[PDB]
Enzyme design. Structure first.
Site, PDB file in Angstrom:
ATOM      1  N   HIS A 289     -34.159  62.498 -54.807  1.00  0.00           N
ATOM      2  CA  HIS A 289     -32.909  63.101 -55.256  1.00  0.00           C
ATOM      3  C   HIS A 289     -31.869  62.010 -55.543  1.00  0.00           C
ATOM      4  O   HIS A 289     -30.657  62.194 -55.338  1.00  0.00           O
ATOM      5  CB  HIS A 289     -32.421  64.157 -54.291  1.00  0.00           C
ATOM      6  CG  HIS A 289     -33.271  65.369 -54.074  1.00  0.00           C
ATOM      7  ND1 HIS A 289     -33.046  66.575 -54.695  1.00  0.00           N
ATOM      8  CD2 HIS A 289     -34.360  65.560 -53.300  1.00  0.00           C
ATOM      9  CE1 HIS A 289     -33.949  67.469 -54.299  1.00  0.00           C
ATOM     10  NE2 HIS A 289     -34.761  66.866 -53.452  1.00  0.00           N
TER      11      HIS A 289
ATOM     12  N   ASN B  13     -33.040  73.705 -52.656  1.00  0.00           N
ATOM     13  CA  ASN B  13     -33.557  73.469 -53.989  1.00  0.00           C
ATOM     14  C   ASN B  13     -33.428  74.768 -54.778  1.00  0.00           C
ATOM     15  O   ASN B  13     -33.089  75.776 -54.201  1.00  0.00           O
ATOM     16  CB  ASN B  13     -35.012  73.042 -53.950  1.00  0.00           C
ATOM     17  CG  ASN B  13     -35.243  71.625 -53.485  1.00  0.00           C
ATOM     18  OD1 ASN B  13     -34.316  70.822 -53.334  1.00  0.00           O
ATOM     19  ND2 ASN B  13     -36.484  71.248 -53.235  1.00  0.00           N
TER      20      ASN B  13
HETATM   21  C1  HEM Z   1     -37.704  72.150 -47.742  1.00  0.00           C
HETATM   22  C2  HEM Z   1     -37.967  71.198 -48.628  1.00  0.00           C
HETATM   23  C3  HEM Z   1     -36.872  70.185 -48.989  1.00  0.00           C
HETATM   24  C4  HEM Z   1     -35.719  70.422 -49.606  1.00  0.00           C
HETATM   25  C5  HEM Z   1     -35.160  71.758 -50.141  1.00  0.00           C
HETATM   26  C6  HEM Z   1     -35.021  69.157 -49.713  1.00  0.00           C
HETATM   27  C7  HEM Z   1     -33.816  68.947 -50.327  1.00  0.00           C
HETATM   28  C8  HEM Z   1     -33.215  67.722 -50.528  1.00  0.00           C
HETATM   29  C9  HEM Z   1     -32.026  67.508 -51.333  1.00  0.00           C
HETATM   30  C10 HEM Z   1     -31.336  68.653 -52.101  1.00  0.00           C
HETATM   31  C11 HEM Z   1     -31.731  66.206 -51.269  1.00  0.00           C
HETATM   32  C12 HEM Z   1     -30.555  65.496 -51.943  1.00  0.00           C
HETATM   33  C13 HEM Z   1     -29.237  65.495 -51.143  1.00  0.00           C
HETATM   34  C14 HEM Z   1     -28.120  64.866 -51.943  1.00  0.00           C
HETATM   35  O1  HEM Z   1     -27.742  65.514 -52.953  1.00  0.00           O
HETATM   36  O2  HEM Z   1     -27.715  63.733 -51.550  1.00  0.00           O
HETATM   37  C15 HEM Z   1     -32.708  65.574 -50.411  1.00  0.00           C
HETATM   38  C16 HEM Z   1     -32.758  64.238 -50.086  1.00  0.00           C
HETATM   39  C17 HEM Z   1     -33.612  63.706 -49.140  1.00  0.00           C
HETATM   40  N1  HEM Z   1     -34.688  64.353 -48.572  1.00  0.00           N
HETATM   41 FE1  HEM Z   1     -35.111  66.322 -48.661  1.00  0.00          FE
HETATM   42  N2  HEM Z   1     -35.782  68.159 -49.137  1.00  0.00           N
HETATM   43  C18 HEM Z   1     -36.934  68.770 -48.684  1.00  0.00           C
HETATM   44  C19 HEM Z   1     -37.963  68.144 -48.042  1.00  0.00           C
HETATM   45  C20 HEM Z   1     -37.831  66.909 -47.462  1.00  0.00           C
HETATM   46  C21 HEM Z   1     -38.736  66.378 -46.474  1.00  0.00           C
HETATM   47  C22 HEM Z   1     -39.948  67.165 -45.947  1.00  0.00           C
HETATM   48  C23 HEM Z   1     -38.295  65.165 -46.120  1.00  0.00           C
HETATM   49  C24 HEM Z   1     -38.881  64.162 -45.106  1.00  0.00           C
HETATM   50  C25 HEM Z   1     -39.767  64.610 -44.205  1.00  0.00           C
HETATM   51  C26 HEM Z   1     -37.100  64.892 -46.895  1.00  0.00           C
HETATM   52  C27 HEM Z   1     -36.344  63.751 -46.861  1.00  0.00           C
HETATM   53  C28 HEM Z   1     -35.258  63.477 -47.675  1.00  0.00           C
HETATM   54  C29 HEM Z   1     -34.510  62.234 -47.701  1.00  0.00           C
HETATM   55  C30 HEM Z   1     -34.886  61.034 -46.811  1.00  0.00           C
HETATM   56  C31 HEM Z   1     -33.546  62.366 -48.591  1.00  0.00           C
HETATM   57  C32 HEM Z   1     -32.443  61.346 -48.983  1.00  0.00           C
HETATM   58  C33 HEM Z   1     -31.176  61.620 -48.131  1.00  0.00           C
HETATM   59  C34 HEM Z   1     -30.049  60.634 -48.228  1.00  0.00           C
HETATM   60  O3  HEM Z   1     -30.318  59.439 -48.520  1.00  0.00           O
HETATM   61  O4  HEM Z   1     -28.896  61.082 -47.999  1.00  0.00           O
HETATM   62  N3  HEM Z   1     -36.837  65.981 -47.702  1.00  0.00           N
HETATM   63  N4  HEM Z   1     -33.602  66.527 -49.974  1.00  0.00           N
END
Ligand code: HEM
Ligand code: HEM
Ligand code: HEM
Lengths: 727, 727, 309, 83
Positions: C102, C175
């Site tokens: 993202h 999402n």
């Molecule tokens: C349910 C499924 C998931 C959804 C809906 C989701 C949603 C998101 C969204 C919308 C962002 C962007 C946030 C922004 O706008 O800064 C994000 C970033 C991120 N996601 Fe998820 N994600 C999912 C699954 C996962 C999983 C399973 C992991 C790790 C096990 C993960 C790790 C991360 C990380 C590390 C970031 C970057 C955050 C940052 O640097 O601030 N995501 N995710």
């Protein structure tokens, strides 16, 4: 330029040499032939220097490293000087964050070997065969102080060992006391903040003798057990070689049949247990803040390799609830009288590093780095630890690739789908960076658990209960262990503990905190409480005087294994003696003294009122190691004074004071012939006194009597005599 | 397991193959035998995978890499899952900050060799002998966009070469146009901020077509010379193989005698110069944002190695002031008519990296990385560059040790007193960490400058003047080079520049900025100015029509070396042709077609309306590489349509659009037999048109025509006709 | 200086205007009367510029911001030019690592308000009262591409909302499709490495249309459900305003009585559901790679505020 | 930059100036200051070139280096007088 002396004296010999005989040097130059697998695998990164051109980091040679580039020899420095800028730039970015806790530590390479196969109880590859040698890297340390604090402070010591096994790194990250201060990892920052320097002014460094510590301790009685240990002489070890080491937590051993045995890990010092006395330790932080570090390094350069015996307290899964204490409570110890330590193997430390920063500073040890054959338990202090070490090293070591920093790398193969990150060294050729994949035929592949070389599977412990933020009621017992420890101590050990709490509590400005600790001590033992109360001008109330003492620990009223000295384990090899010279030493005394010392592996330091040389009665030229003031009695285990022209030093304040400080700190003292005129300086009867060796010459039994004294470490019986003495 | 196909078609042959014939792969798996000294020295860090166990980074074999550890299979994840946490932590820390500028780039390994010894003019070791081979790592890039942006944007391109010499790393960090936008490094942040994404909303990505870029340009007329180049087809290269490279600045060569010679560095593409056309480029940024990166990788996999000749413009020290521009002025070019380029060596790019992140993302080039034999000059933009590249690398690559990152490591020896830094790899055994020292005999030691293998010494240029923040009055002339460039362009290159300015200024929202830019054009050339004013609907004033053009440059009123096309230099080897298939193709047209393409080393891509295969008239089974929409005309250099059953595709709107697009973008089109029915779609007269090959069948005559046209790159006489093609 | 034009056409009107009518501007200059509790507390860090002296970061005024300090106007730049080194230093260290996933996203400030008190099912203060308004910050995004990647690619879209409530920050990180591709977090790096650019060459940018993604999908049938959505027109929203948003997981609502209710979070676009067609979408990555970011910025500038239930 | 983690060390509370500080430097790790200036470069017309350069002068003037005369060759040499 060709600045070394033409005699080649700037260069220490590549052979074992006694402390102070030669300038100390990097491990591989000092002992090139001491190898192990891990030491051999670091050859890819070792860098020489001799005969090479001085260059930049890009390999461009430097013509003039004495000057910046300027417009005129008195002109302004030019931005174009890239040689100056890379040089200052590397210098400006040398430092890295020190460890949050255990910032101060000293390390060394070594190896381990099991006595017999432990296959029946563990499938851990490094314990499966007595001919299986496992390289190790060990780091000893203090808890509180920064990397630049002193060695001989009062503190718990850290004892971490990196085992480079054939099936993975195993780190045994333990301490030198068998319990910790707190029960649940969630309070670590609280406890640590309380012990570290107070937040407004960053005082005091490396000491618990201050308000926040005792404030915390006084409101959290769980801490008393470990505080007892730190208040004792255990908190000021003579050396990293003369203290015990413990895993603290109950862990699991898993065998090939899948059976779990509960284990508590131990290390026994083959040099025995020995500790300084408080005043000596505190002075030593001033006269030589690097005493432990130095001693460890020099023991290894002299061949006195620090050796430890790995031991295991083993408890069957069925006996989990058989003690009065919870096996998963880290503030509780397993008395050796109930559960003996089983000898497992020997660890020998036989080579210093080459570069402290590169090897010691960047070493990353983690308790969750276990291998197949081991497993964890639900100890709540351990449980949070598994979170913390991994986390802290992304910032200390700059990223997730700290395992590629030479000292941290496995000696065994490592393959996976992890990629990138800051400082990535490994260039992955795999067409795939995910699994399951078909494009690399799914390699590298998962591997099923098995008796040898199988994958890691956790033991299926039954888990049952609700999600709760709750301490187990089995953990709510805080005083019997402290009491057990107390009653296992010698009387002189008990007095030293009383004196530690007393000194410590006296540095607490707020009186009510002192009182609160006294009340807590009265829940352990009235005699302790009273003695400390007395030293603080506090009177116990009638209620404190009637608090009923905690129950025995499973029927035990004492366990002698808890004392440093109740059971003699003395060992003189590697200890050091101060020899007080004069300007016409009876050379006959000196040869006797020296040969007897060397015969037992006891070092000597020839001391005098100035540097250089003195010439014995027979014309033997004696090289002086250091002055009376430069190498104080705090740094030696014993003091011997040979005859000759004693009038030369008889009125030397430093020579006299040397004896007084040594006598004060219960060290054996030996006076030959006229050297006995010094008896008056320390008030020794004509008749003599146990702990003082005296004769007409250093012959016959003179060195044997002196060496029997070194074997018992200090002259405990002298305590009452030192009470007075102005030193 | 065994997830791979039994047939083994998941693995690309380890032999040179045409673009799209095999799956691309890491360079050492694709060409294990293409070697050079640098590539072999990275073998200590390369990592395999086949037949290895999946492990943690600590070397612990994983049994189950599909699940986290939980209490019950529908339970909560447990903190003790160290395997999950290690894998998620590493994943979490994968990214590093992209380059501030030139973040988007593509790189390959190669080698360099001089045509002859240049020791009369330089003591640089890599230039000393025609048999000295120097490994190189080249990185091509765009300036403005992020690492994720598109390759075929309009932009200046970077062309960076790291030479691994025997006397250190030399990095020649150039661009694809002979000058820069600004004169003093102090304005780099200003310029760069003007062209990057505007700050409030971070739009637009990869484009100069926005208000702030043209606001800065309009107020800083030193920028107009690079802007003219950006607005020409120079700003939209066909490929990194078909563009020139320049170091831009005047540097110095230093010979063994110490005489200094002014030099400007040049890279001449042996593939020749070629560019796209704006609409093709822009549409390519949407159909394939990785077009250049892809194209470079695949040229290398096919054995179509990018080859460049290194050229020097040499100017004697005494001719410093013989031109009517300042040699130190980075916004001024040295016309090849005045000072010709001496062909000095050749670089061949012959191997892709193994891991993009490891070798391309972490590569660190610096213009200040120079070697004995070279030196700087007072060019005020270069002087500031010397500071920056060192500085930015400390954060991007996490520390002062970025030279220990494998791709950056010198292949020659490197020794100094520099120690520590985050992620130190090198483990120094040197007893000394300072010089002078006597303890290691002063090693490593300084080396006097000399003819070969000497230490670095700056040329002793005389500096005279006051400390001032002042532009040199000699730099204050901004229109003559721009004009020189304009008059050196063919009429269609001119037209493209006018359209480049028009399109861009059409996107500037504040109309006053467009007007101010147009005022700037009036100082260069009125014809240019009016043609651009006309598309913006702006009227030049009376005064602007009388602006007197700038003087010629040292009497030159044009220089053909500045045009891309004025002098024929195109090469068809490595280009690609789309072959539009039908369901009953005339197999004898295919045969003649493919034989001739193969003879010139031109590649082909067989397209159809679906994937799968089609069968020719004769029964030959023809595999389809992509569909009509899937591999648009934009990705090929010419389009050929063979006979057979044209009815199959004569109503396919995608097939018609394919030809309309190719046609609009000035690309050679060949129609065999009934394929001539497509002429109505691109409104070609019955008698034909130059640019369109047509014939009853695809014999040798027809293919010779197609190949002549392709060598001329594009059909420039067609420009006037594309107006009336809805496409 | 007199660099701005005399007619004032360089400054955008500080009132609502339709797309393309004025140069776009920083929100607080474009719409200075718009406010919320979160916008008000950012005031202490906001910095102006009009009528100020240009200075170093230590507050030293700069006389000449066009040149380096050199020995003679044709001479070498001096190391003592601390004004040049600070400026270049700051420039040199402007980037921070992009988001692992993202990285490509566009955000905006707003506010949320419940229709009625939900204290019967949750004790969450921000839903306890219809008058209680909660300032939000919302970032929309794609998953795969880098920060400089195109907006209208075929992707799952992220919808993250930061709720500045009076009893803490609540981030609702979802999402625009109701499920995720994978079942256990342990496979996240696996899936994401497969969808991201192949490790040898770092191709392709912002696209699932390549071998490793499909290899993964084919070996892990659990991904099929989110692939179905991704392959549909859900994968190419017309705008962030016309897409739905889901929290995906079952979370719990906890009331004052201690009762737990399972809950799935949803966002409904009050502007309705709408998507592009594939060819349009992909051509738009070329003509305007910033189309969604621009569309969101302009809708807000125009007063067509993105609304979600 | 490494000790204090980035180029915004002047924004750490103890290090901040109490006088005005305004320029065109943007971003960097842990940026606190939220710049509203439409321009992040100069010269600019869109913000009428603010913040602007200020001529040297007796009070409240911009920094101008003393114009010391520099005469010598580019050398890496210790002045003989420091010997
Ligand atoms: C349910 C499924 C998931 C959804 C809906 C989701 C949603 C998101 C969204 C919308 C962002 C962007 C946030 C922004 O706008 O800064 C994000 C970033 C991120 N996601 Fe998820 N994600 C999912 C699954 C996962 C999983 C399973 C992991 C790790 C096990 C993960 C790790 C991360 C990380 C590390 C970031 C970057 C955050 C940052 O640097 O601030 N995501 N995710
Ligand atoms: C039985 C209790 C504990 C023991 C025996 C223990 C032992 C140690 C030792 C010996 C070290 C120094 C390693 C070295 O020499 O590099 C260390 C460091 C450290 N400990 Fe523990 N510790 C304990 C409890 C904890 C807890 C509860 C936490 C936090 C949850 C913790 C967090 C840390 C951290 C963050 C470091 C720094 C490690 C590094 O930077 O690599 N420790 N501990
Ligand atoms: C002649 C004008 C210039 C040319 C030809 C040039 C060329 C380049 C090139 C080709 C790169 C990319 C290297 C790579 O592929 O990694 C680069 C990056 C860079 N340039 Fe320049 N540049 C110029 C001006 C400047 C100036 C005036 C400055 C600042 C004073 C500057 C600072 C940088 C920085 C900080 C980077 C990023 C390097 C990294 O992160 O490793 N450049 N430049």
């Amino acid at each position: 330029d060709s600045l070394a002396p033409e005699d080649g004296s700037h260069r220490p010999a590549a052979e074992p040499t006694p402390p102070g005989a030669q300038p100390t040097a990097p491990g591989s130059l000092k002992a090139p032939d001491t190898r192990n697998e891990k030491l051999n695998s670091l050859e890819d990164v070792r860098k020489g220097s001799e005969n090479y051109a001085l260059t930049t980091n890009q390999g461009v040679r430097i013509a003039d490293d004495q000057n910046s580039l300027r417009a005129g020899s008195r002109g302004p420095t030019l931005l174009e000087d890239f040689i100056l800028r890379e040089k200052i730039t590397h210098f400006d970015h040398e430092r890295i964050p020190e460890r949050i806790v255990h910032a101060r530590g000293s390390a060394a390479h070594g190896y381990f070997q099991p006595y017999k196969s432990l296959s029946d109880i563990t499938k851990a590859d490094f314990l499966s065969d007595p001919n299986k040698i496992t390289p190790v890297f060990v780091r000893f340390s203090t808890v509180q102080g920064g990397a630049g604090s002193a060695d001989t402070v009062r503190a718990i010591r850290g004892f971490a060992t990196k085992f480079y096994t054939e099936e993975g790194i195993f780190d045994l990250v333990g301490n030198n006391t068998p319990i910790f201060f707190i029960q649940d990892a969630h309070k670590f920052p609280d406890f640590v903040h309380a012990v570290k320097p107070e937040p407004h002014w960053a005082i005091p460094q490396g000491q618990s003798a201050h308000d926040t510590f005792w404030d915390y301790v006084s409101l959290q009685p769980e801490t008393l057990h470990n505080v007892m240990w730190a208040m004792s002489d255990r908190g000021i070890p003579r050396s990293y070689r003369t203290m015990e080491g413990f895993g603290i937590h109950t862990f699991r051993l898993i065998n090939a049949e899948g059976k779990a045995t509960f284990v508590r890990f131990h290390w026994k010092p083959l040099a025995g247990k020995a500790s300084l006395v408080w005043d000596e330790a505190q002075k030593l932080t001033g006269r030589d803040p690097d005493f432990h570090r130095r001693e460890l390094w020099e023991a290894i350069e002299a061949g006195d390799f620090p050796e430890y015996e790995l031991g295991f307290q083993l408890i069957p899964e069925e006996d989990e609830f058989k003690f009065d204490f919870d096996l998963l409570d880290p503030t509780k110890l397993i008395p050796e009288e109930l559960v003996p330590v089983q000898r497992v193997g020997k660890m020998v430390l036989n080579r210093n590093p080459d570069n402290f920063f590169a090897e010691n500073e960047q070493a990353a040890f983690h308790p969750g780095h276990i291998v197949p054959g081991l497993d964890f338990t639900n100890d709540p202090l351990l449980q949070g630890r598994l979170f913390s070490y991994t986390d802290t090293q992304i910032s200390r070591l700059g990223g997730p690739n700290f395992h590629e920093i030479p000292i941290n790398r496995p000696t065994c193969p490592y393959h996976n789908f992890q990629r990138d990150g800051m400082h990535r060294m490994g260039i992955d050729t795999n067409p795939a960076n995910y699994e399951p994949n078909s494009i690399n035929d799914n390699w590298p592949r998962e591997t099923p658990p098995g008796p040898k070389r199988g994958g890691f599977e956790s033991y299926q412990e039954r888990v049952e209960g609700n999600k709760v933020r709750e301490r187990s009621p089995s953990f709510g017992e805080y005083y019997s262990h402290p009491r057990l420890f107390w009653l296992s101590q010698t009387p002189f050990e008990q007095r030293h503990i009383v004196d530690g709490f007393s000194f410590e509590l006296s540095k607490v400005v707020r009186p009510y905190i002192r009182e609160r600790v006294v009340d807590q001590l009265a829940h352990i033992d009235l005699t302790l409480a009273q003695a400390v109360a007395k030293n603080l001008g506090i009177e116990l109330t009638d209620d404190q005087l009637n608090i009923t003492p905690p129950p025995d620990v499973n029927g035990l009223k004492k366990d002698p294994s808890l004392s440093l000295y109740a059971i003699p384990d003395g060992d003189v090899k590697g200890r050091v003696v101060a020899i007080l010279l004069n300007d016409e030493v009876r050379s006959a005394d000196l040869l006797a003294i020296l040969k007897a010392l060397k015969a037992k592996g006891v070092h000597a330091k020839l001391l005098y009122s100035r540097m250089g040389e003195v010439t014995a009665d027979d014309g033997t030229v004696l090289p002086i190691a250091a002055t009376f003031a430069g190498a104080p009695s705090l740094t030696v285990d014993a003091v011997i004074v040979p005859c000759g022209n004693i009038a030369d030093i008889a009125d030397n304040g430093d020579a006299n004071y040397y004896l007084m400080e040594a006598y004060k700190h219960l060290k054996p003292i030996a006076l030959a012939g006229d050297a006995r005129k010094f008896k008056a300086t320390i008030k020794i009867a004509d008749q003599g006194e146990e702990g003082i060796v005296e004769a007409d010459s250093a012959d016959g039994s003179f060195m044997d009597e002196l060496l029997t004294l070194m074997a018992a470490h200090r002259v405990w019986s002298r305590i009452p005599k030192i009470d007075k003495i102005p030193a």
